[PDB]
Design a binder for this molecule. Structure first.
Ligand SMILES: Cc1cc2c(cc1C)N(C[C@H](O)[C@H](O)[C@H](O)COP(=O)(O)O)c1[nH]c(=O)[nH]c(=O)c1N2
Ligand SMILES: Cc1cc2c(cc1C)N(C[C@H](O)[C@H](O)[C@H](O)COP(=O)(O)O)c1[nH]c(=O)[nH]c(=O)c1N2
Ligand SMILES: Cc1cc2c(cc1C)N(C[C@H](O)[C@H](O)[C@H](O)COP(=O)(O)O)c1[nH]c(=O)[nH]c(=O)c1N2
Ligand SMILES: Cc1cc2c(cc1C)N(C[C@H](O)[C@H](O)[C@H](O)COP(=O)(O)O)c1[nH]c(=O)[nH]c(=O)c1N2
Ligand SMILES: Cc1cc2c(cc1C)N(C[C@H](O)[C@H](O)[C@H](O)COP(=O)(O)O)c1[nH]c(=O)[nH]c(=O)c1N2
Ligand SMILES: Cc1cc2c(cc1C)N(C[C@H](O)[C@H](O)[C@H](O)COP(=O)(O)O)c1[nH]c(=O)[nH]c(=O)c1N2
Ligand SMILES: Cc1cc2c(cc1C)N(C[C@H](O)[C@H](O)[C@H](O)COP(=O)(O)O)c1[nH]c(=O)[nH]c(=O)c1N2
Ligand SMILES: Cc1cc2c(cc1C)N(C[C@H](O)[C@H](O)[C@H](O)COP(=O)(O)O)c1[nH]c(=O)[nH]c(=O)c1N2
Ligand SMILES: CC(C)=CCOP(=O)(O)O
Ligand SMILES: CC(C)=CCOP(=O)(O)O
Ligand SMILES: CC(C)=CCOP(=O)(O)O
Ligand SMILES: CC(C)=CCOP(=O)(O)O
Ligand SMILES: CC(C)=CCOP(=O)(O)O
Ligand SMILES: CC(C)=CCOP(=O)(O)O
Ligand SMILES: CC(C)=CCOP(=O)(O)O
Ligand SMILES: CC(C)=CCOP(=O)(O)O
Ligand code: NA
Ligand code: NA
Ligand code: NA
Ligand code: NA
Ligand code: NA
Ligand code: NA
Ligand code: NA
Ligand code: NA
Lengths: 208, 208, 208, 208, 208, 208, 208, 208
């Protein structure tokens, strides 16, 4: 297969819970193993913004997401916010790509400064020190200089700063079309197949 | 009235032509004078992404946008890309707020480095030196370190970097709802009334 | 009225005494209260460059400038260079805008580094810490890297660096026309009405 | 195959047109797809420095280079300098490696600052934000501090700064031998096979 | 003779066309060879601000300036904005001093960042890399932090940042006296004789 | 196979000769080709800290290490400290990964500043310019700010700074267990199989 | 006595619990007063890596460590993670030296940025502002640029960054010998007597 | 004569020995005194890349180069790599210009950091502190960020970074033509006459 076998998908408390759920669904349909992390604020966002009734505790959350996505048993692992026995907490784990989608400005700050106050932040710290893929999907507006300095520091170190800023150049007709544009960019960045966003200009052989 | 009487609205060639058109429409309905600038690439974006048939030359473009928006005669001024006789080209003009919506990464770069190769770039140079409002609405993903350094430099100088990253926390039901979220943020930043985005928590008096 | 009720006008020992005297005259005619400070070197410049016979001591200087400008009694206050009992020396004073016109490279340096060796330098230190308007009008050529670093530091902090560099785009016919161009820019920056410099392009509705 | 299937080859107006033509020829013989971009100044350089009579417009240029290189139909695509419908203009395109050979100091500057004034500059902006290979082949002497700061910024971000500085350690006998040394370095950097430059010390098992 | 035999004089689109014309006239009267460059915006400034009817195309412009200045045949060369065959485009040319008078903020930016979009910008790039004299005469007010950072970068590299800020310490009686003050500073910087500005204090042997 | 076919293993004069010898042994058992470099100080460390009687000259050293490791003929190449004919001295060599284990603070400094005083330092210079893997294993305590700045500069450029700081989270029972922890991290970083350090949490499917 | 009478010993959640326990034991045997702090993650590390059954709550933990170390009554104080009434929380306390052993990357980050989220982080903030000794013993590999920047910032301010990187130059025969090497370095840094690590070269009077 | 009477020419171990030999020959034919320094690695390069049989020790090397170049007795001085009695080692010597051609990345590093490990490095240290001409001719590809930072630091201090990157704009027909292009640039930088590279555009009086 193309791209990573395992993806750590962390959802944090920015608006845009739909991006993370749709990414999760695509990862599952591409038969990838997903190590799923979600912050307490992201649980509140998901309740506010969607009709998904996500259970609170990891074992029930795992059963629920497995059913919601049509995943195979064991395909989605869920790890709690202080579970240092989970693979993402150590660089001696098997390699994963990591995506924080959406990424709050507070989680952006923790990753940029190296805070390790929960398993999402430790997992990102591990991705950076092991030079494993790390994609952050910030959703905020305006971006202040504090946000921008934190994004710049991480981008300089090879993290991919992929804002939740959908493009309109395929004439979107629904909210779902805009969500899929951003999710397709994430999948493209990871090297994972996707058929929601065509390859720009692939059939264009010479200028008019 | 609250907020600026005059707004220089520049559209450049990032995806998201719908944001600039909807902003223009709101500015007109709030009875503001709009100095409208559009780049050659933005004209191509508008043709690709919308069904608006915008005429090419300033005088016809002015007549068209006046009709499209229901504007009063003279409310929308259109200035061409080398018209140094227009108000935005000089700091001795009457004060305007300026918005570049959407803002391409190339126009972001020109503004951050002080290039003055067309009237949009000179207008932003003037806003910064006169300390008049300047709002940039970048639409790009990922943001590279070059983008981020350019945004950081301008934000440090007081420009507002407002990415086209809509929020979902009022349960959007259409593309138009997401466009209106971003446009409402711009209007809020300018100090101009808007009724598309409620005031978060205004009725919340104490925690549960 | 528009703009500040009170302006601290400091003259320091750069060439261009005529700019400060003409600014003083305009401020008086707009019925503003002026807290007037002048350095010992600026007194020598004024004697060299003009026919104004400015008395040396504050009380006589106050009487003289009141007559020279046609000011109301008490409209121009004059404070000596170590008078820490004057309003500009403390941030607990009533708010003023401040202009140093002209600004020597030596006073530019003191303001940029926070030296507080006389009341002009302390007044600027107070403007910066209170976030009250501060406009510097440097007159020097060439500008060395030391000058430029000092100007950059202050501009980054929100001071307005307005060099004594008049524009020619209204066909000046006299020295006085060039002096008035710079003074009009200062008044525009302060938000004070002026009729010497028209609003560029105000009557220009569309490009040719 | 080893290395990228598609290469965006941009020629800009530095001396050394022979490097870009020889690279193009090698890429074609390795059966790679080439998206060919050339600046207006580079067309003047190619006329000055070589006997290649390159047609001006993209469709004729494509036919000419196809014949000149012995390429298969469709193997060389040519895109004009404002053709935003071409794959290199968008990060949603299929992935290419990109080489700017030769790279003028002016194109180096545009890439380092994020200017996007033509399709070569936008293509490089896209390579950087997508973290796709970008190789710059500057040809200039001396290198000023402005050149060097621009090269350093891009190298820090992962672009390969490969100056047109041939090596002599295989006893070159012709201009073509020196051109081939630089082209072999570019091919090595891309991961594409080449037999012009041997693998240094491959047969050396222990020190004398 | 003292000072450079050849001067590249570039005029760009800042206010102050009179400074460049008066400099040109002085250079001619000192029997210097002048390589004259003028931007399209500077042509518009010259029409706005002066009664000089400068022809548009280089050959007619050369004939006109030769007559206007009383120059010898061949003393003033005029080169168009993309003429890479002119001496200033290459560091292998015979050495010139270069002055950009006046210097727009946009040309200041291009020189500071190394953009090479026309022959004025390439000529300055060449002056810096060859360590040949480069004098910039910016005319703008206020100077923003973007302007100031660009001036500081170039001054640190040895360019002379000489703002169009005339001095008043010889009691100017006309616009022409102020223009001559700035032109005399430029000539002094180049090492070229001038008799418009006396040598300050040359007859002062001891303090009073 | 997974990971690099060839590894340049340089040992320098920090304490921890056992790490480099154990790494060499693992590389040999994974059937990798090893280009072995050792500094004069590292030879003294190996004599002090181990019972390995390493011969001084490259040909005898090669024979000895081949026997000590059970390597195939030609699998371990040894190159002397000024042998510029060896593959690591040139970027035109076949690609290797490089590890400096252990890495003295003096070799760390040389690599960070680009000193090229022996073949280890040149080899690292080549790895960085070719963007080939470079892993440094510093052993020092305390780390001063000079050490830390040198490590930071190289890590920013993509070198892996992997201190000889073993972990205890698998209950080590011997010196050899701690040495193997660090060697396993190096092998993991290179992408080479190892069975000394389990994959953390690989069997952990959900939180307790 | 030599060295500090009181040491704040904080253990945080890096691997290497044995270093902190052995340091505690040495401090007790040198009759020092120890203010003992341990994070919740460090309690989990100690359970994983050792057979020490450390009670959870401070009063029981104090009784246990007193017995485990053979300490005098009151010699070991234990303070909980939000006990702002403990001496380390205020710079008006009696002076202590402080050691964080081991130091997680997350606690390193908090100290470098000034976060004060628990008593360990506040205690370090106090040590830095009072210029009292602060020693950090990080255990991590690789060190990322985020780790390295945080270590560099603190080392520049006078904190001692002492990685858990034991030396082998006295022929260690057990895990305990390597642990004692690091603990001896810490004691040496504090100025406290130790007999585990000899004074290098103390008997060496002249070179061979 | 024009340009320096004495030139310190140092050859170091980059590829491009032919540039240094051809420069030496030109300097001799312009009747300049040459203080010739060559590193041990450069001697190996010269043997690899040329048929020049350069003797090893300074006195024989001096006799050989005198014959090879047709120099006058005493015109070429040769100084060994630790000869601190030679003029280049002290700033109290008579002034020379200095050229390092070719310049290895290792010698570039030493000069940028101030290492003074041999007479070439001390000579460059002296040139910089005395503000005497220093020209470095690096030959390397790619240039890494370490190379680029070292070149930038020195260029900022006034050293001329002149890469061995020949131009093709006079239609070179041989290796020797390309070598002569670079040597002519060096001679131009020093102010020494040369007739290998014409003065670009010297006969071009106006644009077509
Ligand atoms: C409905 C809703 C929507 C948002 C938020 C909150 C809620 C409840 N918050 C604030 C964010 O959740 C808060 O700063 C948390 O501290 C983030 O914690 P984590 O980073 O998820 O641990 C938030 N934060 C942010 O950076 N971007 C956003 O778009 C939003 N939007
Ligand atoms: C349909 C379409 C869509 C986009 C673009 C182009 C086109 C045709 N371009 C590229 C952009 O237009 C190009 O870099 C221009 O050079 C921008 O010029 P202006 O800044 O508008 O003068 C573009 N650029 C960018 O920064 N963000 C974007 O989202 C897009 N999207
Ligand atoms: C007639 C005349 C003209 C000038 C000056 C002096 C005199 C006597 N000085 C020098 C300046 O006065 C001197 O550096 C003082 O130290 C400035 O002191 P204050 O900053 O006014 O206290 C001066 N300084 C400067 O920065 N720009 C200028 O244009 C001039 N011109
Ligand atoms: C024959 C010839 C040779 C050269 C050039 C020109 C010409 C006509 N130019 C100048 C360069 O073309 C100019 O600055 C253009 O503006 C570059 O534009 P592009 O970057 O190609 O769009 C040039 N520029 C540069 O950076 N390095 C070089 O070696 C040369 N050599
Ligand atoms: C009459 C008039 C006066 C001015 C200008 C314009 C016109 C028409 N412009 C704007 C300037 O010409 C514009 O930014 C151009 O893009 C500059 O292009 P060049 O740098 O000359 O290629 C201008 N720009 C500037 O930096 N300083 C100035 O004083 C002025 N004044
Ligand atoms: C037994 C023994 C142990 C050590 C050392 C030496 C010896 C003899 N040295 C010092 C180091 O060898 C010295 O600074 C050399 O200059 C390093 O040279 P290389 O970098 O190997 O060429 C040393 N240096 C260092 O950075 N870390 C260390 O742990 C040690 N330990
Ligand atoms: C067994 C074991 C081993 C380790 C860890 C955990 C566990 C359970 N953690 C992760 C660390 O505990 C986590 O990031 C905590 O957030 C650290 O919190 P404190 O800094 O102690 O509050 C960890 N962290 C680190 O920086 N270095 C390390 O060596 C280890 N090793
Ligand atoms: C044939 C040949 C060719 C080259 C080299 C070597 C040899 C033998 N070396 C490596 C260089 O000589 C080495 O790093 C020395 O340490 C340089 O020492 P000096 O700076 O001359 O003392 C080398 N180094 C470099 O920076 N650029 C180059 O082009 C080459 N080419
Ligand atoms: C949870 C755990 C074993 C963390 C240690 O991981 P690593 O050695 O710091 O990569
Ligand atoms: C178009 C024009 C008059 C530009 C000059 O404006 P400003 O004095 O630079 O603010
Ligand atoms: C002259 C005086 C009372 C200075 C103190 O003012 P502030 O409190 O420092 O703003
Ligand atoms: C030409 C085009 C569709 C540009 C937009 O690309 P991207 O989403 O900015 O990578
Ligand atoms: C127009 C031209 C020949 C440019 C090349 O000049 P240079 O070698 O870059 O100084
Ligand atoms: C030993 C040698 C041929 C060094 C030159 O290598 P490279 O071209 O600098 O990568
Ligand atoms: C817990 C406490 C009294 C903290 C205040 O201490 P300090 O004055 O900030 O050193
Ligand atoms: C070899 C020698 C006398 C070096 C001292 O020179 P300088 O005084 O440091 O310029
Ligand atoms: Na923490
Ligand atoms: Na411009
Ligand atoms: Na003082
Ligand atoms: Na642009
Ligand atoms: Na350009
Ligand atoms: Na060296
Ligand atoms: Na806190
Ligand atoms: Na030395």
């Amino acid at each position: 297969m193309s791209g990573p076998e395992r993806i750590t998908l962390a959802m944090t408390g920015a608006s845009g819970a739909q991006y993370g759920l749709r990414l999760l669904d695509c990862l599952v349909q591409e038969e990838r193993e997903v190590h799923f992390l979600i912050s307490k604020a992201a649980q509140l966002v998901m309740a506010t913004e969607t009709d998904v009734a996500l259970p609170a505790k990891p074992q029930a959350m795992q059963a629920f997401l497995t059913e919601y996505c049509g995943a195979a048993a064991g395909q989605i692992r869920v790890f709690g916010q202080n579970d240092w026995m989970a693979p993402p907490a150590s660089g001696s784990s098997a390699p994963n790509a990591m995506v924080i989608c959406p990424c709050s400005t507070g989680t952006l700050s923790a990753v940029a400064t190296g805070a390790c106050n929960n398993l999402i932040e430790r997992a990102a710290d591990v991705a950076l020190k092991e030079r494993r893929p790390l994609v952050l999907v910030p959703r905020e507006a305006p971006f202040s200089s504090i946000h921008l300095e934190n994004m710049l520091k991480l981008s300089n170190l090879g993290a991919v700063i992929l804002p939740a800023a959908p493009g309109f150049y395929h004439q979107p007709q629904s909210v779902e079309d805009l969500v899929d544009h951003v999710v397709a960019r994430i999948l493209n960045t990871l090297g994972i197949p996707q058929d929601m966003l065509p390859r720009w200009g692939e059939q264009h052989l010479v200028s008019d």
